[PDB]
Design an enzyme around this catalytic site. Structure first.
Site, mmCIF file in Angstrom:
data_model
loop_
_atom_site.group_PDB
_atom_site.id
_atom_site.type_symbol
_atom_site.label_atom_id
_atom_site.label_comp_id
_atom_site.label_asym_id
_atom_site.label_seq_id
_atom_site.Cartn_x
_atom_site.Cartn_y
_atom_site.Cartn_z
ATOM 1 N N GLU B 34 0.711 -1.263 0.659
ATOM 2 C CA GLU B 34 0.097 0.174 -0.074
ATOM 3 C C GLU B 34 0.708 1.609 -0.088
ATOM 4 O OE1 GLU B 34 -4.188 0.608 2.196
ATOM 5 O OE2 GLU B 34 -2.440 1.912 3.603
ATOM 6 N N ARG B 85 -3.963 -3.912 0.193
ATOM 7 C CA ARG B 85 -5.571 -3.615 -0.052
ATOM 8 C C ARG B 85 -5.597 -3.710 -1.413
ATOM 9 N NH1 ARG B 85 -5.211 0.024 4.629
ATOM 10 N NH2 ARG B 85 -6.472 -0.827 6.443
HETATM 11 N N1 LIG Z 1 -7.114 4.723 1.048
HETATM 12 C C1 LIG Z 1 -6.821 4.762 1.925
HETATM 13 N N2 LIG Z 1 -5.715 3.870 2.105
HETATM 14 C C2 LIG Z 1 -4.816 4.066 3.477
HETATM 15 N N3 LIG Z 1 -5.380 4.716 4.613
HETATM 16 C C3 LIG Z 1 -6.084 5.490 4.538
HETATM 17 C C4 LIG Z 1 -7.161 5.186 3.513
HETATM 18 N N4 LIG Z 1 -7.826 6.885 3.563
HETATM 19 C C5 LIG Z 1 -7.531 6.408 4.628
HETATM 20 N N5 LIG Z 1 -6.811 6.612 5.250
HETATM 21 C C6 LIG Z 1 -6.143 6.533 6.423
HETATM 22 C C7 LIG Z 1 -6.303 5.480 7.648
HETATM 23 C C8 LIG Z 1 -4.493 5.636 8.410
HETATM 24 O O1 LIG Z 1 -4.911 6.632 9.769
HETATM 25 C C9 LIG Z 1 -3.973 6.935 7.780
HETATM 26 C C10 LIG Z 1 -2.560 5.767 7.630
HETATM 27 O O2 LIG Z 1 -2.908 4.046 6.786
HETATM 28 O O3 LIG Z 1 -4.313 6.704 6.240
#
Ligand SMILES: Nc1ncnc2c1ncn2[C@H]1C[C@H](O)[C@@H](CO)O1
Ligand SMILES: O=c1ccn([C@@H]2O[C@H](COP(=O)(O)OP(=O)(O)O)[C@@H](O)[C@H]2O)c(=O)[nH]1
Ligand SMILES: O=c1ccn([C@@H]2O[C@H](COP(=O)(O)OP(=O)(O)O)[C@@H](O)[C@H]2O)c(=O)[nH]1
Ligand SMILES: Nc1ncnc2c1ncn2[C@H]1C[C@H](O)[C@@H](CO)O1
Lengths: 225, 217
Positions: B34, B85
């Site tokens: 990711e 993811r």
């Molecule tokens: N699409 C996404 N992918 C991964 N994280 C997401 C996403 N949108 C929001 N978050 C928020 C979660 C964590 O606090 C922070 C780091 O993962 O980002």
């Protein structure tokens, strides 16, 4: 084999009028409006785009990035379906380009601080990328009018939201139009664009029913491509 | 031909660890982390500072950054590509929640879902999944592994946010209630592994299961 011309110029210089003139002079000639112009006055597309336009007008420093994003992707898809559906000597007439999106509008919001370093940096990438991933144009036609002719034209148009747009903005957008399309000074990352041929057309005079010369000028330049 | 398997999981549920754990086991097994993990670093930071300002902008950069990363790795005998993811995660987990908690409005939300519907209607082109593996953990669990991971800006994640998110995972990947505009997905088999117990030095049972699952596709 479809030729591809973009028709470019400042707010209210006469693009849609010109575009809807050539429209009926040939059936080898098609025209793709600019999506933003349909959200501008008076479906899920229209709903959103008109929602986005009003917000960008009311608080640009919050809504420039989202507006630029939706408006570019709208021109992109609008432009793709006109390869599909229609058109011996076919030309497509684009009402502005994904290049205007970026070197005229997007750019001016950065310099005016309506998009920040991150915002504008993330737009340049998406842009570069989304476009590299069929619409590259055979030519550009520049309908050149003054900020003042431009300012009077939007008043003749009488659009609610546009009556407040002040001469000073138009004055910024003219300069960029000029550096790109006439002195060919503005420099970019669509390299072909540095040498796509261009025709500049003076539309400060009203041409709504005296357009034969401008059109002969178009026909001539088509012939040269 | 390259099989595509996403590891889904709540925040710090083990995902990054199991996927690397997997990375060492087989020639035929690689991974696309990711991109938000390495973070993006401003847009993410602006995301924690004021989410109702930056939610839309992040989601778009987040998701496209994952599509680029995944495609890049989209070019062994029995190839399996694992993603960290996926673009369904980006939409039905995160953007969804963030719309749900008013950090986006309807315009924002509609405009995202249209752009996702289109960014990926040209790009199911091997980003479309063959399986999903759901690392299901309790929210409580994930909250300790965030202190485990000891990450600056991630330190204040509530108890309740992590709740929001697992209920959404479980509706999507266990109950299969959740509906989307990828009809294929509802087909696609999921595998569901419990990860509350540490597994860094005890994963054979886990991987065995992965192996049965791959074997049946
Ligand atoms: N699409 C996404 N992918 C991964 N994280 C997401 C996403 N949108 C929001 N978050 C928020 C979660 C964590 O606090 C922070 C780091 O993962 O980002
Ligand atoms: O030769 C012309 C061209 C146009 N206009 C008027 O100026 C306004 C704006 O022109 P248009 O919408 O075509 O401009 P665009 O933004 O498309 O360049 C409209 O009321 C046009 O009728 C004009 O008075 N004379
Ligand atoms: O069985 C495990 C699984 C994970 N972790 C730890 O939990 C924290 C978050 O793990 P990871 O990055 O894998 O979570 P993700 O966000 O990637 O799901 C890290 O400190 C891991 O070392 C652990 O201690 N035991
Ligand atoms: N990329 C764009 N394309 C078309 N218009 C733009 C764009 N950015 C801002 N605007 C402003 C000009 C008018 O006020 C209004 C209608 O064009 O929106």
């Amino acid at each position: 084999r479809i030729k591809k011309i973009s028709i470019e110029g400042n707010i209210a210089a006469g693009k849609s009028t010109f575009v809807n003139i050539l429209k009926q002079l040939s059936e080898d000639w098609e025209v793709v409006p600019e999506p933003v112009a349909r959200w501008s006055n008076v479906t899920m597309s229209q709903k959103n785009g008109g929602n986005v336009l009003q917000m960008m007008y009311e608080k640009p420093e919050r809504w420039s990035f989202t507006f630029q994003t939706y408006a570019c992707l709208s021109r992109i898809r609008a432009q793709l379906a006109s390869l599909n559906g229609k058109l011996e000597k076919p030309v497509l007439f684009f009402e502005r380009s994904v290049y205007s999106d970026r070197y005229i509008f997007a750019s001016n919001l950065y310099e005016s601080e309506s998009m920040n370093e991150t915002e504008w940096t993330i737009y340049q990438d998406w842009h570069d990328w989304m476009n590299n991933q069929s619409l590259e144009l055979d030519g550009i036609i520049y309908l050149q009018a003054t900020p003042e002719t431009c300012l009077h034209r939007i008043y003749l148009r009488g659009r609610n939201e546009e009556q407040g747009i002040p001469l000073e903005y138009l004055e910024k957008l003219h300069y960029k139009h000029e550096s790109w399309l006439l002195h060919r000074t503005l420099k970019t990352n669509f390299d072909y664009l540095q040498e796509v041929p261009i025709l500049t057309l003076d539309v400060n005079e009203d041409f709504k029913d005296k357009y034969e010369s401008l059109v002969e000028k178009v026909k001539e330049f088509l012939s040269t491509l």
